């Protein structure tokens, strides 16, 4: 009976390892590649982007006003804020899933 409980706990630990691998994929690939992307959305003001662009535009603005309103500058920042909210939610969910996986692994290990 203890061995069947241990086998259930080992299956739970294998499921927790699979969930940790899924968390690796989702959140850690978020971190690495999609936070290269996120810090590039922020680099649109920090690294090779913006630098607080307030310079006056010339005649016949090819976007460059619609840009900063909602296009490759303004909607860039808007989607960056949306993705930053999404990434804050993803980081909170990563913390929650890490807590859940740790609780599952602690139940498995205590058992």
């Amino acid at each position: 009976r203890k061995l069947r409980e241990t086998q259930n706990t080992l299956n739970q630990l294998n499921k927790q390892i699979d969930e940790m691998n899924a968390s690796i994929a989702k959140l850690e690939q978020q971190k690495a590649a999609q936070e290269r992307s996120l810090a590039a959305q922020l680099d649109a003001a920090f690294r090779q982007g913006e630098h607080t662009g307030i310079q006056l535009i010339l005649s016949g603005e090819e976007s460059q006003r619609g840009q900063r309103l909602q296009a490759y500058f303004g909607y860039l920042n808007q989607a960056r804020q949306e993705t930053i909210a999404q990434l804050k939610q993803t980081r909170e969910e990563v913390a929650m899933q890490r807590a859940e996986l740790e609780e599952k692994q602690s139940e498995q290990q205590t058992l």
Binding site: Q34, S37, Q41, Q64, L69, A71, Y72, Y75
Partner: protein, 299 residues
């Protein structure tokens, strides 16, 4: 009508009598007059001439994820072609993807941040329907009331940047033009008045032999109109030397900056008007001066 011929002959002889005095008077009238006729190139050419639209709010509603190829016509069937709108600038999905990449916004995040959720939308050209300020304004939100388009980045544009030209510029240049079109009158009148003052002696002499009030006047009027007319004609001979010379500089900056502004010259419909106006100014100045100096010799 031999009186007209005799008066014209006398005026011509009086002008030809002092070639250096006549030429130096025509020279100042022509130079003092080419400034209005060369600064009118600027306000006729370039400004006004190359009038390229203005900061008009083509900005429009921002469509949600429900926007597609079919929804583009549906939005047109509601606001982008049924309400006030002239042109279609629906850059939905991939259309504003590579263009967004080659703009000031650098790309490369799209391959990393899954897919770019470029908030859909479609710049419009509010036709008469919504063109009107109020036609838009209130019905601008009504335009938003069409298909989907979650948001409506519709904007205004122009702002005060459209005041540091309708204000500062709209008064200074007019003031300068008024100054020049007073200077030309003043210089022509002064020249003619001094010409009559030089020969007042003959006025007195032929007044006290009899004569009439009108007989004494004609050689001075015809010699005051011929001074304005001949000084304006040389300003048209000039002011084309300068404009053609300036054409080279404007042509060079055409390609460096963008659209090629085309320069031109003064037209006949304004050349004739300029000649007539200068003739009238000279005539009236001669009349004023002679009548002033004809009541002096009446004891």
């Amino acid at each position: 009508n031999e009186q007209v011929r005799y008066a014209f002959h006398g005026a011509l002889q009086d002008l030809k009598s002092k070639p250096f005095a006549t030429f130096l008077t025509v020279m100042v009238i022509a130079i003092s007059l080419t400034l209005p006729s060369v600064c009118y190139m600027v306000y006729k050419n370039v400004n006004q001439a190359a009038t390229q639209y203005y900061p008009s709010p083509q900005i429009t509603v921002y469509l949600q994820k429900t926007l597609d190829d079919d929804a583009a016509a549906g939005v047109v069937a509601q606001l982008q072609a049924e309400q006030g709108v002239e042109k279609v600038n629906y850059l939905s999905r991939e259309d504003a993807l590579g263009e967004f990449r080659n703009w000031s916004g650098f790309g490369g995040a799209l391959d990393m941040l899954e897919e770019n959720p470029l908030p859909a939308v479609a710049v419009v050209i509010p036709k008469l329907d919504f063109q009107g300020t109020e036609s838009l304004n209130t019905l601008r939100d009504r335009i938003t009331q069409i298909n989907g388009i979650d948001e409506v980045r519709m904007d205004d544009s122009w702002f005060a940047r459209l005041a540091a030209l309708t204000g500062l510029v709209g008064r200074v240049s007019a003031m300068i033009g008024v100054l020049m079109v007073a200077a030309v009158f003043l210089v022509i009148g002064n020249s003619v008045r001094l010409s009559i003052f030089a020969r007042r002696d003959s006025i007195n002499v032929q007044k006290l032999i009899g004569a009439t009030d009108g007989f004494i006047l004609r050689p001075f009027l015809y010699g005051g109109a011929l001074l304005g007319f001949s000084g304006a004609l040389l300003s048209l001979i000039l002011s084309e030397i300068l404009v053609l010379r300036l054409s080279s500089a404007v042509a060079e900056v055409a390609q460096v900056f963008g659209t090629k502004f085309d320069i031109n010259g003064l037209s006949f419909d304004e050349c004739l008007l300029l000649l007539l106006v200068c003739s009238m100014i000279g005539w009236v100045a001669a009349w004023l001066a002679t009548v002033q100096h004809l009541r002096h010799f009446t004891p």
